[PDB]
Amino acid sequence: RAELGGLERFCSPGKGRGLRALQPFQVGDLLFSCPAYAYVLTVNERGNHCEYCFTRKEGLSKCGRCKQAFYCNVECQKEDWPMHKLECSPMVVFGENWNPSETVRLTARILAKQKIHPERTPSEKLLAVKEFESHLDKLDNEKKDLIQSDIAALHHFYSKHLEFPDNDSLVVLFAQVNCNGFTIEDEELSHLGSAIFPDVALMNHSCCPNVIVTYKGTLAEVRAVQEIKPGEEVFTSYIDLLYPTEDRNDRLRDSYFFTCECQECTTKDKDKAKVEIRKLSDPPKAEAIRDMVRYARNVIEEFRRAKHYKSPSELLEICELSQEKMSSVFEDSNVYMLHMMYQAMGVCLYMQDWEGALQYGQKIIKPYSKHYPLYSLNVASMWLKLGRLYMGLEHKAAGEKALKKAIAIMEVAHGKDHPYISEIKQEIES
Ligand SMILES: Cc1nc(N)c2ncn(C3CN(C(=O)c4cc(CN5CCN(C6CCCCCC6)CC5)n(C)n4)C3)c2n1
Numbered sequence: 001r002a003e004l005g006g007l008e009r010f011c012s013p014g015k016g017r018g019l020r021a022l023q024p025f026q027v028g029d030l031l032f033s034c035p036a037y038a039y040v041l042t043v044n045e046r047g048n049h050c051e052y053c054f055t056r057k058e059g060l061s062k063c064g065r066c067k068q069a070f071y072c073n074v075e076c077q078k079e080d081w082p083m084h085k086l087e088c089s090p091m092v093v094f095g096e097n098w099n100p101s102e103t104v105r106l107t108a109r110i111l112a113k114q115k116i117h118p119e120r121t122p123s124e125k126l127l128a129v130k131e132f133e134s135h136l137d138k139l140d141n142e143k144k145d146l147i148q149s150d151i152a153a154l155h156h157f158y159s160k161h162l163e164f165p166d167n168d169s170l171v172v173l174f175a176q177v178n179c180n181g182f183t184i185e186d187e188e189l190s191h192l193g194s195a196i197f198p199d200v201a202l203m204n205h206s207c208c209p210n211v212i213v214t215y216k217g218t219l220a221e222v223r224a225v226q227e228i229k230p231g232e233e234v235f236t237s238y239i240d241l242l243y244p245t246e247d248r249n250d251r252l253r254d255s256y257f258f259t260c261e262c263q264e265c266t267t268k269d270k271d272k273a274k275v276e277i278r279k280l281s282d283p284p285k286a287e288a289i290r291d292m293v294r295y296a297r298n299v300i301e302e303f304r305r306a307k308h309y310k311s312p313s314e315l316l317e318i319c320e321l322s323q324e325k326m327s328s329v330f331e332d333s334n335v336y337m338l339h340m341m342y343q344a345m346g347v348c349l350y351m352q353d354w355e356g357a358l359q360y361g362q363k364i365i366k367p368y369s370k371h372y373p374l375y376s377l378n379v380a381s382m383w384l385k386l387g388r389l390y391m392g393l394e395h396k397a398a399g400e401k402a403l404k405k406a407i408a409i410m411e412v413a414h415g416k417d418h419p420y421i422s423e424i425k426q427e428i429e430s
């Protein structure tokens with residue numbers, strides 16, 4: 001199945017539908033772009049980005065009716081109106097209690113899009129939204145109850161402005177959205193919004209992917225990070241590649257109900273380094289290691305929950321205490337330590353403790369470089385944060401160096417002409 005040039009849809013043995021190359025692609029080549037089928041700017045970025053096109057700039061004009069949507073100009077505002085009108089009056093009516101989840105917000109837009117544009121869109125050249133996997137038969141009752149709550153919230157916040165299909169159809173759709181929806185992030189991997197990119201959702205998973213997905217406004221772009229030969233399958237990663245094999249496959253199993261057999265998962269080459277044990281005089285016993293791994297996974301999950309109701313200083317305390325406890329057995333380059341160091345850095349940034357955030361960054365960066373693959377956005381984002389921190393604290397040489405490391409990754413991932421790169425070059429001069 002063809003039309004996107006140089007590519008086709010096919011049946012990948014052992015995996016199912018996928019995407020393969022018909023022509024070579026070199027590192028940094030653009031395979032395809034996919035316009036968003038539906039998308040929504042996250043609430044905390046309102047006023048910083050245009051709701052229609054996601055341009056980040058000053059001096060955006062306001063929707064006069066609700067005062068909660070911002071735009072480059074009246075053309076962006078008018079083009080956004082079919083989607084924005086789903087929320088404009090409801091925000092006025094509900095005021096401070098207007099609070100649908102972002103999943104609910106995105107699903108409302110999908111429904112409006114289906115009504116206005118029932119035919120195949122340019123976002124769906126090889127895979128249609130209706131063909132999305134739901135995994136509905138594999139979901140437990142807890143997840144199905146959350147789907148029913150989303151349906152309830154959809155009705156509650158959007159009923160004046162949408163006609164709904166039946167409960168059965170919404171259950172399928174919500175399940176499809178839960179597992180197919182993408183996040184759009186900025187250059188520091190900060191959350192900007194959510195979107196549906198149907199053609200991107202065709203790609204199968206590898207823990208050594210040969211492409212990387214980036215965003216230019218609401219457009220997804222897919223570039224090669226390894227050489228791809230004619231006839232080879234195009235693989236993205238569905239999950240965070242920092243973690244060792246068991247953890248990667250736990251996340252794959254819980255969200256998509258499969259496990260990976262790629263070369264990384266097969267060989268487990270990076271696993272030993274990822275869970276590095278301190279080389280002490282009396283080395284830690286095997287039991288103690290299992291104990292500390294168990295503790296680490298617990299605190300990682302505990303911390304995920306705790307950030308919905310603890311203060312910044314309490315969160316930093318959990319990070320510090322967990323790091324102290326883990327350091328009896330784990331090296332600082334160990335991925336569970338890096339996890340908590342990364343959370344700590346974010347808490348520091350939130351509190352405007354620039355020095356503290358910088359110190360955490362300096363310890364994270366070299367382990368990141370080794371644990372992630374070559375052209376990782378996680379690595380690039382960390383160099384950029386370091387660079388910006390260094391610049392702000394007047395370490396101009398160190399800052400320039402870090403920003404250059406960011407650029408060298410981003411030229412490949414984002415393309416040399418991406419506006420993010422122009423902005424970062426300006427920071428090196430200014
Ligand atoms: C045996 C085997 N081995 C493999 N190596 C492999 N690779 C892919 N598969 C099959 C099984 N698949 C799915 O269950 C699937 C695929 C998608 C599309 N999703 C992916 C996540 N996508 C982002 C990931 C990035 C971060 C944001 C979240 C969603 C959205 C689109 N869904 C919702 N289910 C396809 C494989 N099977």
Ligand SMILES: [Zn+2]
Nearest residue numbers: 050053072076
């Ligand atoms: Zn705009």
Ligand SMILES: [Zn+2]
Nearest residue numbers: 063065066088
């Ligand atoms: Zn409005």
Ligand SMILES: [Zn+2]
Nearest residue numbers: 207260262265
């Ligand atoms: Zn794998």
